[PDB]
Write a protein that binds this DNA or RNA. Structure first.
Ligand SMILES: [Mg+2]
Ligand SMILES: [Zn+2]
Lengths: 1319, 652
DNA sequence: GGAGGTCAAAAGCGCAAAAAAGC
RNA sequence: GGCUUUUUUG
DNA sequence: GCTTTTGACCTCC
């Protein structure tokens, strides 16, 4: 079964893998993000509500007054999208917020309210997203790309010893908050722990430890293990367990209860550990020499003397042992300090602590944060507190806290936005464990540590910054308390927030100018992920690791589609099925596998979870019951790819297409292409130019329909029905009975854009693709946009190509193209240019626009009206005049055609400031626009009044008035008629008054439209009025253009060749492109040969259908053929039966297939060569796909048969007339007197420094001396050069470059004296 | 400078000067009333800050920023750096009489000329046209001449053609890596809007026809014109300065044409007959009466310069093919016939061309190169060599071989299950097994592809070198190598992780057939690395060149002889295996520091202060001298220069 | 007492193009 | 005509 | 951020 739109031309496709999940809405990453930013969230966790709850309520310093938030809404936009685009105003919505002002008595208990005041407050204009996920700022369309940055949390990284000579590995731990100051813990080559904040001077770590009110004893308790000693008779015995014997050497014979357990002198052994644990002995004596290396854990003082016998973190000797024995200190606490297991890391840092009382510690912190300042204790305490524990100045966000807890093996994932002592302690402990071999470092490039930030988050961040500024302002204002004099609106000033949001949307790193010259470009532009921008890497700062592709990129970002050159691997594009998680992590679909059966259940898996399961392959051969046909299948588990049994699998890929982006997925036969050539093929396919008339690609992928429909370039039926009136500019759709609303059903109208400039000077055009009086359903395609054909993406044309060297005209990469291509206008494009003339008010008289021009012949005024603006349709050329603007001196400042560009004027737009008289030309355009708008509105009026009067006649027939008498009477007389039945009379007068209601609201919308059109346009200050002119040019292909295929075989047209010279086969049909075979093997993009072969069969089926149509053979035998073509193939998923099709549908489909049957091919489930041969056999074509050809010039048969087929060719956006220019003598720069640069400025080229070296390498000195002095800047001498040339004498004058004198003065502008010398 | 509207454009210099002068005025006014010292200290200090910012912004600390929030330019900022005065407006500066365009191949041009669009030529030579119009009297005032130029009158094109007969122009392509990046040409007027270029020199520019753009400059004076003609003309640049190797080597399409010309078939139409000469042989091929390549006997005549610079004729019969006889016409007199009797791949043909330059000077060798290019293009076009899907012959054994390899690993993994092998042992074992399987498959594929059977004259199968299109385009060296042919038919081979580890499971599929999803994925690890390295190597490498130029830009040869005996000994470099560089090339083209002494004691093989060349080097080879001490530039004694003999022989 | 070790600051990091905006 | 920001090609 | 280099302060012998 099919809807009626695709029944017009069913595109046959190969492919053996059934679809489980169809392609989602391609734009869901963008649009669904912004919906989180303006919808009302009762929970207060998303967008504006969450932003408001984080600043409000605000209380005065005295606390007698506060301001509270109530609710908000977004007002209706003043204009729609089209009016904003034409007028150059930002499509935006006003912001309404209900604020509450509460006053407290200072003489009453707290909470006693003096008065309350409720009032909505204007807060500014918020830009609003259009229907296609774009933004409109100043008549243009800008789209916000999605950033990709380091996930807030904590990471452990190792530098691999590169920075040190010995290569010893150093470990560091970093905590990256969502907003606030960082924190770094590092190990030095001396193996001591240090802490630093915000990349400042490195500081000993223990400084922070005591800053949290920790004594030395507490630190040693937290970071080490205790060893206890008891004073027995002349002995210091200790309790020993086997577990604490790892990696130790028995200095003496380990024995207890009089039995020797361990040998003496050598290292410990596991067998001795086993026998000791079997004995289960705890206490053991130790000699004195073994205690010579241990460190006391705690402090010891004498009760009698009261003096410190020995403090903690201090080595002990036999004399200290004597004091502790004579003082009664029986129990001695020491540190375990096993270097191979528990290194003395913290103790050594303790040994280098400058102070211990935490006062000088806070002083040191405060000095380090800001050098050269008085160290006030309270100031230092406040600095530390608001540095790492203030709720406003530091915030870790929900996702950061979740990552922090997950990394530290905690369980609860909900917490505060500020840190805690325990969290820092835990991070330190895990860093020590990492140093001890336990655990493993994290990976930066892993997609589990990087998140996707959309437009919503960025808008929220800008809004919060603005809100902080305005709340500081209102707090300052409220500090000067007043006895309820003000209303809760004066203190709130919307200018800061409005300016902040506007500047972020307008001028920023990521707000980019959308390049919409074909639907694929703008789709793949909306779906871009960038690692640049605020809070990310720069173009140079990135190393060789971020650029490279990581094994967790499977299914989430396209590995083969990315810009090439200065930033590669930083602008990777999102995949097809991938969608962002709730936290902001990329995740992909998968199918659950239970008991070797693959169900249709779909689970979305993020990066981290992908590391725990076993994932099968997309094209894993499968039975009819979900059982894997082998017991051995290919799978991937953790970045590896290995065989597995049928029972260890858990998930399988949804479809074979889920690895590449859209741009790569549009490339047929991708599975036979090198990665480099596929990359360049996609990147060039993104840059096609719309053709004058579009043609379907014969060999596509099959998702062109999805790409075209998803992008907003083709009008789509909102409600199904039957088409009523069709026009080259408007379409009228009457809705069906079921789909109409209960009231005011009416009809639906679509207005089509015709020849409006794009953002790269190409033409946006729409042509209806439906006829009069045929049904349409919901979601069909009614009007094809640019480069679209029946709702199918169509970038370029399809040309009859042959691979053979031809007298060198296609020597290296060039293409030789026959004249029959340019005769049929298959590549001539339309380019539209824009010119603007401004009228300001300067001195010496303002800028006036009129037809009065001095010192000009009547030729320059023939193409001008009496109002001073060119007529619509004049064939203007270079150097002519468009808008006559003069300034009294009269100064001829009128706008002129830029040199070298011709065209035909198609539209003129005039903008006038409010309160300014409009000239007659603006009056004409205004009245014409009003007339067209009233024509439209009166058309809807006629339809609606006809409907309501049909209702009225239905009422009146039942009322008693005869139908014939009704019909004879005039239209408006039906209301005044009398009806005997009261309710029928009541219904008649009621309809006459909703007649009145309808006409009156039509009248008020009339007056509103008339006022808006007459309403003065908002302009820049100091500007009176501006005028704009549009120019239309048709470009044809000429030697030097850039044409390219889809697989990366670009090139340049060499020579347009007369048709009689091209090679031709036995049938006499020439080939109109002659490519070059030598570029296939080395480039190794063998996909193009297979595509050529497949296309050659596509026209083979097309020609036969053409033969039957010419002979007008019966539908029965025709219907027989078409069905046989579709059934061809092995286990093809698509099955089409033409029995259900009626004869008319079959005939229309056949005549629509006349130019060749489209053949589709999924990206990685392509058609093999066997069915290609089979399809070729269906026609009368040779199976090998190599026919003979005859030379056009000689008529001699080519010795070896060559390849002929149909290849899809795009014309790139690189035209010669946009790049070829030359200069003899033009303008000159004002400062250095060197000629200008750039084609638009008519300047010469740059004799580069490398060119100077190369010209120095020759003996050529005179030419270099020319380049330096005469042709560049010797203003005194270069004039003499011109005069000499005209006289015939070829000689120069050296002179001295003027640019050197400037520098002289400039050096003299400092205190340096530099001067020349004598001759 | 004023823009549209009442606003004015102001530079950073004006703002800083205004600030400093205003502060000076304020302090000088405040000092007159003798304010308390606390006031004057701050004013003087912050005036110091203002002057500091004036002379150099951002050196001391926080920099002065404007409305753009970015630091303002200062005097020190306007001298240093790429945007400063020196590197942007003194060492390189924009010029007049220049233009830009897109490159396009032209086969019909000769070696010493290039195309030019009409509009570019007219715009460039407009100053020259004005003078010539005055001389012929077509217009008297310069205004009149300018008027008739823009109308494109019929006389304008005639006078332009007359004035551009021998006016050389310069062609360069940024970046100009080596000195061959700028070459002179003699323009010829063509239609269209693209610049036409000769194919042979495209290798020197490293320029391909995929949208690369050229710039043209025009010399003015007689000194400049003669300088260009005698130094930078194309015909004077055939040996690269880096090394003696030629720079006009034919490539790609021409090579395939020559290869297809000279290759016999075991049987063909018109095989086994006798032909009078090459002139007659061309008559047979065009008439279709004999195949382009079939072994015959032809009378040929070759000349030798073996006498005292004189050519002597000789005549006999040689057993060759029709195509070789056709090719023999364009070879000049001196060369022997054996040089044009082999398969004539890429490596051979250049060699042959080089021999001409060794014997026939310059004019014959350039004419011969041009004739080679013409004939190659013509007979490659008439050949019709095309690539199809069936040309990729997939070896039959390949499939089963993979099975065997599988069985091998099926055992090795078991050894890990039993614990008898470690991770490293298994890894190395599977790596070796897969590498051996790859080598076997590649060898089998090449052996199957490179030969084919065709019936001879007596009706028996005979093996000849195959005429498959891919093999022809690979063996001739026209384009590609055995690695790519491996990539098409046999397995792709082992692929690497980003860090450097080798994946244990190789890609068993080839490009002719399909690649399942994960194989294509793991194949992109290497390609992204290659693209990233290629993109980021051009930034580092080019910069390095700069540092080399500024160090060595003071070196010019100034004196003939320095008169020192000091030098460095030269020996063939050896690591213990084969010689990496023999003694021949290292010492070639230098001067002997001391006389070369024979292994026989007290015999003078080579006199002191004698340049070495082919006539002296072969003498060393026959005599088998071990090592020689040669004079070198590092030891020359002349100050502020380099001895002429010390530098040795100019390689150009 | 000083010669050695270790930490802190400045300077650089292709070239051509084009296209736009904005200041 | 200077600077800033991107995008793209080589 | 890379990397180098150079200067300046600490300090171990
Ligand atoms: Mg190129
Ligand atoms: Zn010398």
């Amino acid at each position: 079964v099919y809807s009626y739109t695709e029944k017009k031309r069913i595109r046959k496709d190969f492919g053996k893998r059934p679809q489980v999940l169809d392609v989602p809405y391609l734009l869901s990453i963008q649009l669904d993000s912004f919906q989180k930013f303006i919808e009302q969230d009762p929970e207060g966790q998303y967008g504006l509500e969450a932003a408001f709850r984080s600043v409000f309520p605000i209380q005065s310093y005295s606390g007698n007054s506060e301001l509270q938030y109530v609710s908000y809404r977004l007002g209706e936009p003043v204009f729609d999208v089209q009016e904003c685009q034409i007028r150059g105003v930002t499509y935006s919505a006003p912001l309404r917020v209900k604020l509450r002002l509460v006053i407290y008595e200072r003489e009453a208990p707290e909470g006693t309210v003096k008065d309350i005041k409720e009032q909505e407050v204007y807060m500014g204009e918020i830009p609003l997203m259009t229907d296609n996920g774009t933004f409109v700022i100043n008549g243009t369309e800008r789209v916000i790309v999605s950033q990709l940055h380091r996930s807030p949390g904590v990471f452990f990284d190792s530098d691999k010893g590169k920075t040190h000579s010995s290569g010893k590995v150093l470990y560091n731990a970093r905590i990256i908050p969502y907003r606030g100051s960082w924190l770094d813990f590092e190990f030095d080559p001396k193996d001591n722990l240090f802490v630093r904040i915000d990349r400042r001077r490195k500081l000993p770590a223990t400084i922070i430890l005591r800053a949290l009110n920790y004594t030395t004893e507490q630190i040693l308790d937290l970071f080490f293990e205790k060893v206890i000693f008891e004073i027995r008779d002349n002995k210091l015995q200790m309790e020993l367990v086997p577990e604490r014997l790892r990696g130790e050497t028995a200095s003496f014979d380990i024995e207890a209860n009089g039995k020797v357990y361990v040998e003496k002198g050598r290292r410990i052994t596991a067998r001795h550990i086993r026998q000791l644990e079997k004995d289960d002995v705890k206490l053991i004596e130790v000699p004195v020499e073994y205690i010579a290396g241990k460190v006391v854990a705690k402090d010891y003082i004498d009760e009698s003397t009261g003096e410190l016998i020995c403090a903690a973190n201090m080595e002990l000797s036999l004399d200290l042992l004597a004091k502790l024995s004579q003082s009664g200190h029986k129990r001695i606490e020491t540190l375990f300090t096993n270097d191979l297991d528990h290194g003395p890391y913290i103790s050594e840092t303790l040994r280098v602590d400058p102070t211990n009382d935490r006062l000088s510690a806070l002083v040191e912190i405060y000095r380090m944060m800001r050098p050269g300042e008085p160290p006030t204790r309270e100031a230092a305490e406040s600095l530390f507190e608001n540095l790492f524990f203030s709720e406003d100045r530091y915030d870790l966000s929900a996702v950061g806290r979740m990552k922090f807890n997950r990394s530290l093996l905690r369980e609860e994932i909900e917490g505060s936005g500020i840190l805690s002592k325990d969290d820092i302690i835990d991070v330190m402990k895990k860093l020590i464990d990492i140093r001890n071999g336990k655990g493993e470092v994290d990976d930066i490039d892993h997609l589990g540590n990087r998140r996707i930030r959309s437009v919503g988050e960025m808008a929220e961040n800008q809004f919060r910054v603005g809100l902080v500024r305005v709340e500081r302002a209102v707090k300052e204002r409220l500090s000067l308390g007043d006895l309820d004099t003000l209303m809760p609106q004066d203190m709130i000033n919307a200018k800061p927030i409005s300016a902040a949001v506007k500047e972020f949307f307008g001028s920023s790193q990521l707000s980019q100018f959308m390049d919409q010259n074909n639907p694929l470009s703008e789709i793949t532009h909306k779906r871009r992920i960038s690692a640049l921008g605020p809070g990310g890497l720069t173009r140079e700062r990135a190393g060789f690791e971020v650029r490279d592709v990581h094994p967790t990129h499977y299914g989430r970002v396209c590995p083969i589609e990315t810009p090439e050159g200065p930033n590669i691997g930083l602008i990777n594009s999102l995949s097809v099925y991938a969608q962002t998680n709730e936290y902001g992590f990329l995740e992909t679909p998968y199918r659950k596998v239970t008991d070797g059966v693959v169900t249709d259940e779909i689970h979305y898996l993020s990066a981290i979870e992908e590391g725990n399961y076993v994932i099968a392959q997309a094209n894993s051969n499968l039975d009819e019951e979900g059982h894997f046909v082998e017991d051995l299948v290919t799978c991937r588990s953790k970045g590896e790819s290995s065989l597995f049994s049928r029972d260890q699998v858990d998930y399988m890929d949804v479809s074979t297409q889920q690895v590449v982006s859209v741009g790569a997925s549009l490339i047929p036969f991708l599975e036979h292409d090198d990665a480099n050539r596929a990359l360049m093929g996609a990147n060039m396919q993104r840059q096609a130019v719309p053709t004058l008339r579009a043609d379907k690609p014969l060999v596509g992928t099959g998702m062109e329909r999805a790409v075209a429909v998803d992008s907003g370039v083709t009008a789509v039926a909102k409600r199904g029905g039957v088409v009523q009136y069709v026009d080259a500019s408007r379409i009228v759709i009457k809705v069906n009975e079921d789909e109409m609303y209960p009231g005011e059903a009416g009809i639906d109208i679509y207005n089509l854009t015709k020849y409006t400039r794009s953002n790269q000077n190409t033409c946006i055009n729409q042509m209806p693709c439906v006829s009069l009086g045929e049904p349409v359903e919901r979601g069909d395609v009614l009007a094809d946009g640019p480069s679209t054909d029946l709702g199918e993406l169509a970038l370029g044309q399809n040309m009859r190509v042959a691979f053979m060297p031809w007298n060198g005209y296609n020597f290296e990469d060039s293409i030789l193209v026959s004249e029959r291509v340019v005769q049929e206008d298959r590549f001539t494009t339309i380019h539209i240019q824009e010119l603007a003339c401004v009228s300001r008010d300067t001195k010496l008289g303002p800028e006036e626009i009129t037809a009065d021009i001095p010192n000009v012949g009547e030729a320059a005024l023939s193409k001008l009206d009496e109002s001073g603006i060119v007529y619509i349709g004049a064939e203007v050329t270079g150097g002519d005049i468009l808008v006559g603007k003069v300034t009294p001196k009269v100064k001829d400042s009128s706008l002129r055609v830029p040199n070298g560009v011709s065209g035909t004027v198609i539209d003129v737009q005039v903008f006038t400031r409010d309160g300014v008289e409009k000239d007659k030309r603006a009056l004409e355009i205004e009245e014409m626009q009003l007339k067209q708008a009233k024509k439209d509105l009166s058309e809807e009026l006629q339809i609606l009044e006809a409907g309501l009067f049909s209702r009225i006649r239905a009422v009146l027939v039942a009322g008693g008035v005869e139908a014939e008498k009704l019909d004879k009477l005039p239209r408006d007389r039906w209301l005044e008629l009398g009806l005997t039945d009261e309710e029928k009379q009541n219904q008649l007068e009621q309809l006459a008054e909703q007649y009145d209601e309808l006409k009156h609201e039509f009248e008020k919308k009339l007056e509103a439209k008339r006022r808006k059109i007459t309403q003065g346009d908002d302009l820049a200050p100091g500007v009176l009025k501006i005028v704009k002119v549009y120019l239309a040019v048709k470009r044809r292909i000429q030697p030097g253009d850039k044409m390219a295929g889809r697989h990366g075989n670009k090139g340049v047209i060499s020579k347009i060749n007369p048709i009689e010279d091209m090679p031709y086969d036995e049938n006499g049909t020439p080939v109109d492109i002659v490519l070059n075979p030598l570029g296939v093997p080395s480039r190794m993009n063998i996909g193009q040969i297979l595509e050529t072969h497949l296309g050659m069969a596509a026209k083979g089926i097309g020609d036969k259908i053409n033969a039957m149509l010419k002979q007008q053979q019966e539908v029965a035998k025709l219907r027989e053929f078409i069905q046989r073509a579709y059934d061809l193939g092995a286990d093809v998923r698509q099955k089409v039966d033409l029995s259900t099709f009626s004869d008319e549908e079959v005939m229309r489909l056949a005549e629509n297939l006349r130019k060749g049957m489209p053949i589709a091919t999924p990206v990685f489930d392509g058609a093999k060569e066997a069915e290609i041969k089979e399809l070729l056999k269906l026609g009368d074509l040779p199976t090998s796909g190599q026919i003979r050809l005859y030379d056009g010039r000689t008529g001699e048969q080519f010795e070896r048969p060559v390849t002929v087929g149909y290849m899809y060719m795009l014309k790139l956006n690189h035209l010669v007339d946009d790049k070829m220019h030359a200069r003899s003598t033009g303008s000159y720069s004002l400062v250095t007197q060197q000629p200008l640069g750039g084609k638009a400025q008519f300047g010469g080229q740059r004799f580069g420094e490398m060119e100077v070296w190369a010209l120095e390498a020759y003996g050529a000195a005179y030419t270099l001396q020319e380049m330096l002095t005469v042709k560049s800047d010797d203003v005194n001498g270069r004039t003499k050069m011109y005069k000499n040339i005209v006289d015939g004498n070829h000689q120069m004058e050296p002179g001295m470059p003027e640019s050197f004198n400037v520098l002289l003065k400039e050096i003299r502008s400092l205190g340096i004296n530099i001067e020349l010398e004598d001759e | 400078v004023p823009l549209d509207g009442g606003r004015f454009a102001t530079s950073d210099l004006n703002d800083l000067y205004r600030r400093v002068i205003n502060r000076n005025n304020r302090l000088k006014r405040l000092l007159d009333l003798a304010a308390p010292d606390i006031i004057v200290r701050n004013e003087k200090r912050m005036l110091q800050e203002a002057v500091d910012a004036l002379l150099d912004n951002g050196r001391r600390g926080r920099a002065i920023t404007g409305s753009n929030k970015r630091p303002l330019k200062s005097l020190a900022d306007m001298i240093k750096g790429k945007q400063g005065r020196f590197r942007q407006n003194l060492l390189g500066k924009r010029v007049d009489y220049s233009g830009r365009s897109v490159i396009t191949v032209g086969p019909y041009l000769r070696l010493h000329q290039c195309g030019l669009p009409k509009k570019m030529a007219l715009e460039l030579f407009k100053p020259f046209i004005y003078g010539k119009l005055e001389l012929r009297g077509l217009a008297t005032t310069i205004k009149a001449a300018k008027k008739m130029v823009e109308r494109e009158e019929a006389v304008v094109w005639d006078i332009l053609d007359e004035v551009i007969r021998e006016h050389p122009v310069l062609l360069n392509r940024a970046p100009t890596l080596h000195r061959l990046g700028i070459q002179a040409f003699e323009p010829v007027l063509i239609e269209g809007k693209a610049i036409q270029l000769h194919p042979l020199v495209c290798a020197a520019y490293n320029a391909d026809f995929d949208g690369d753009q050229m710039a043209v400059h025009v010399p003015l004076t007689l000194e400049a014109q003669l300088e260009a003609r005698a130094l930078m003309m194309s015909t004077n640049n055939i040996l690269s300065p880096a090394n003696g190797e030629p720079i006009i080597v034919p490539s790609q399409d021409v090579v395939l044409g020559l290869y297809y010309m000279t290759r016999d078939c075991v049987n063909a139409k018109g095989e086994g007959m006798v032909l009078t000469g090459p002139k007659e042989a061309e008559r047979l091929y065009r008439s279709g009466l004999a195949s382009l390549h079939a072994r015959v006997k032809v009378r040929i005549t070759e000349y030798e310069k073996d006498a005292n610079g004189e050519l002597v004729a000789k005549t006999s019969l040689k057993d060759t093919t029709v195509g070789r006889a056709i090719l023999w016409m364009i070879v000049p007199k001196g060369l022997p016939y054996s040089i044009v009797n082999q398969a004539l791949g890429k490596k051979a043909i250049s060699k042959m061309l080089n021999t001409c330059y060794r014997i026939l000077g310059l004019k014959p060798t350039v004419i011969f190169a041009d004739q080679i290019m013409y004939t190659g293009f013509a007979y490659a076009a008439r050949s019709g060599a095309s690539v199809g899907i069936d040309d990729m012959v997939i070896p039959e054994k390949k499939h089963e071989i993979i099975s065997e390899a599988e069985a091998e690993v099926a055992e090795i993994q078991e050894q890990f299950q039993s614990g008898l092998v470690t991770a490293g042992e298994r890894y190395n074992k599977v790596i070796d097994i897969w590498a051996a399987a790859n080598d076997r498959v590649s060898k089998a594929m090449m052996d199957n592809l490179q030969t084919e059977t065709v019936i001879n004259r007596d009706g028996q199968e005979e093996k000849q070198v195959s005429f498959n299109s891919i093999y022809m385009m690979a063996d001739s060296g026209a384009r590609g190598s055995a690695a790519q042919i491996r990539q098409l038919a046999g397995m792709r081979g082992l692929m690497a992780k980003p860090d450097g580890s080798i994946i244990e499971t190789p890609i068993t599929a080839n490009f002719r057939e399909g690649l399942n999803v994960l194989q294509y994925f793991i194949s992109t690890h290497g390609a992204r690395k290659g693209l990233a390295d290629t993109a980021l190597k051009t930034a580092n490498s080019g910069y390095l060149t700069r540092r080399l130029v500024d160090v060595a830009q003071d070196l010019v040869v100034t004196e003939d002889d320095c008169g020192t005996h000091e030098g460095i000994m030269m020996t063939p470099v050896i690591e213990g295996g084969d010689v990496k560089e023999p003694l021949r090339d290292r010492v070639l083209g230098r001067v002997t520091a001391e006389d070369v002494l024979k292994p026989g004691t007290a015999d003078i093989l080579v006199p002191r202060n004698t340049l070495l060349h082919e006539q002296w080097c072969d003498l060393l080879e026959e005599n088998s001298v071990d090592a020689v001490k040669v004079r070198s530039v590092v030891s020359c004694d002349t100050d502020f220069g380099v001895c002429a003999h010390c530098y040795g022989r100019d390689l150009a």
